[PDB]
Design a protein that fits this description.
The structure is a homodimer. By secondary structure, chain A is mainly alpha-helical. In chain A, about 85% of the residues lie in helices and about 0% in strands. The first copy, chain A, is elongated. It is classed as dna binding protein.
């Protein structure tokens, strides 16, 4: 879980976002939303 | 940008999410939303 722990420090991701375009940032937000929604389905099923 | 490129592969984040609780996943989604919104402000200003 090295990529999940980095998401907790926004300042670190802030420096990484400065080297990427907005279109790549939109795709990254989609994947994180699906990952949280995937766990939401397991929480709603239990 | 090692944490930003990992977010593109949801299957990889999928295995990492299985080892964390939903509360930690909610905070991670907040940071990514703020990172994308921070770049949105720069795009709207330009």
């Amino acid at each position: 879980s090295e990529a999940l722990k980095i998401l907790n420090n926004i300042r670190t991701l802030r420096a990484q976002a400065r080297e990427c375009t907005l279109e790549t940032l939109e795709e990254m937000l989609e994947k994180l939303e699906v990952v949280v929604n995937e766990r939401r389905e397991e929480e709603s099923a239990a």
